[PDB]
Design a protein around this ligand. Structure first.
Ligand SMILES: *Cc1c(COP(=O)(O)O)cnc(C)c1O
Ligand SMILES: *Cc1c(COP(=O)(O)O)cnc(C)c1O
Lengths: 344, 344
């Protein structure tokens, strides 16, 4: 019974219904042709083999010899690699400096403008929120920026869909991506892609031969424990997003608590996400004398029914407060206090 | 307790060890960096999000403005769609005519020659065996053809790896693909890709930024119930391939049995694969008077603990004899005999 705090898993905590559902192993059509689009607040929605898989879909789908794409400096690495695999020139829109590391809609506007000078920017993309500091840029404004520049906007909602309530039509962006195995409590490699219909005959184009298969996805009907789980949990996730406010509240408390404890949280302040990135000079000093040194932390927690931090990290690290019940939160806060006093 | 005969599943029958393995949910490095390459008899091997996923990998990875690719007329539809998604011109090498529908290394040679006249054939591909009739072309010879033409050969072993023993180095082709969820007793969307090392810095190229991630796969470490199952069953599959001879024997018997029964098996004769495609004019006639008509078959079998044939098909259909124990085979043969006499 390990209290998990790893970001990559608090949101992908597999549902009971989906757990059982995997044992015995459908409205698939109903799902992706009704439920799903409604949930992402958008016209067309499809299920892909993961977010990065969808992110590439549209990139490959709109790329152009010597074209460009603008993505925030906090872009997940798959957003960047999948740009490369599309052969796109990539321009990063710079982040604020410590402790903000924020993606301002203004820098975006410039980046987008500076780039265009260099060529055609076939696409724009913001990681909302970035998996780094848990920062939630101002898409509503950014999406405005992109629209008054005629450069499609893809939102990497990998860390928002399945957690916080979101709607493509709300935001005003053109595309939207989600990851079922980290935010939607699903399993295996699976993802969700949403778009304005206008971009269907573009991305969702069919083969010449097999008029029924969609080329950009390889005519995949992706049946497998993947969707199975995703669907099974979906009802849960539907209701889940309602408590977002308590989740941000909680993560906020745990945050300032750490504050008093001598370790700081950078980025959004107040923060707006269970995923927070901390600076703990103290734990770094200790690590210089501490038992295992660089690993004294992992050691200390792995011995307190706690795990979720890349073992070896003491100075900087990130963590989620998502599933964590107030008591589990407190327990974790206390856990820190202890390890602090322990070493001098 | 349904005796399954569907091709898409006899080989993907999930293993016990892998079944349990999914419950509780590693030498991953050991697997893909030792076991796997050894098993496919090749230098480099990687695990992808499915065969079609790998098939595209190399296609995208070697494509070229206005380039070409030659694939057998029996090519699975994903081999064709994934060619389209790479933007490749596609040239099909014609199959023999009823009842052979065979891919002769000679037509290949011509197709490859005829095409080159039209441009550069960056790649060649044979489905070994095709998922249509279960035909096993003469790759050893075809692979020779391609080599004396300097056109890389990708083998779509979707239906051979995990069933029959195979070795890239044996065949002499450049690439090799397999599907874990239909031949390797795995789950979800997963696949295996194998190649001569010379094609690594090509396909397995890393991003500029993330020097550790491989661009052609999106730096995916594809951890998930996918690999988990695949690995868990692998030991089993390793030994499985040894009985191939009894499998072809069995499927051969069941075949000629159907022969006496008035329904014929086209393609390889003797056939060389548990997957066989049959012609049953008789069942077609019956369907014209029979109870449910076009569905009288599905009806008749769904009522005899048997399923695995696209309901509606009576005139033509395909089936696997893979998992089926002699008695299950016999039972199925008898089942047919019965439904035959039943209707006049
Ligand atoms: C994990 C992650 C992804 C990739 O998710 P997949 O479904 O495995 O491709 C993309 N973006 C962010 C911000 C992530 O954290
Ligand atoms: C099913 C099949 C494929 C596709 O397998 P995936 O792993 O789902 O992409 C490819 N080739 C053949 C011959 C098949 O039968």
């Amino acid at each position: 019974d390990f209290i998990n705090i790893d970001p990559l898993q608090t949101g992908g905590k597999l549902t009971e219904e989906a757990r059982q559902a995997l044992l015995e192993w459908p409205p698939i059509h109903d799902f992706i042709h009704n439920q799903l689009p409604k949930f992402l607040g958008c016209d067309v929605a499809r299920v892909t083999n993961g977010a990065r898989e969808a992110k590439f879909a549209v990139m490959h789908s709109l790329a152009k010899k010597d074209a460009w794409v603008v993505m925030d400096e906090n872009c997940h690495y798959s957003s960047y690699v999948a740009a490369e695999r599309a052969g796109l020139n990539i321009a990063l829109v710079p982040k604020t400096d410590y402790p903000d590391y924020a993606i301002t809609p203004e820098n975006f506007a410039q980046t987008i403008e500076e780039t265009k000078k260099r060529g055609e920017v076939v696409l724009a993309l913001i990681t909302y929120p970035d998996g780094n500091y848990g920062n939630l840029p101002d898409v509503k404004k950014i999406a405005k920026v992109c629209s008054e520049y005629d450069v499609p906007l893809l939102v990497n909602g990998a860390y928002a869909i399945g957690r916080m309530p979101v709607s493509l039509k709300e935001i005003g962006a053109d595309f939207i991506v989600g990851s079922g195995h980290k935010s939607m409590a699903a399993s295996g490699p699976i993802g969700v892609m949403g778009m304005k219909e206008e971009w269907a005959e573009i991305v969702l184009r069919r083969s010449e031969k097999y008029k029924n298969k969609e080329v950009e996805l390889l005519g995949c009907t992706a049946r497998g424990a993947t969707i199975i789980t995703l669907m099974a949990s979906f009802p849960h996730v539907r209701e889940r997003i309602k408590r977002w406010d308590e989740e941000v509240e909680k993560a906020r408390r745990f945050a300032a608590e750490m504050e008093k404890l001598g370790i700081k949280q950078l980025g959004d302040n107040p923060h707006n996400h269970d995923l927070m990135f901390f600076h703990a000079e103290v734990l770094y000093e200790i690590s210089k004398k501490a038992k295992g040194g660089r690993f004294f932390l992992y050691r200390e927690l792995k011995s307190r029914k706690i795990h979720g931090i890349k073992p070896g990290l003491t100075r900087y690290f990130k963590l989620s407060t998502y599933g964590l019940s107030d008591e589990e939160v407190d327990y974790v806060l206390n856990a820190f206090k202890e390890i602090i006093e322990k070493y001098s």
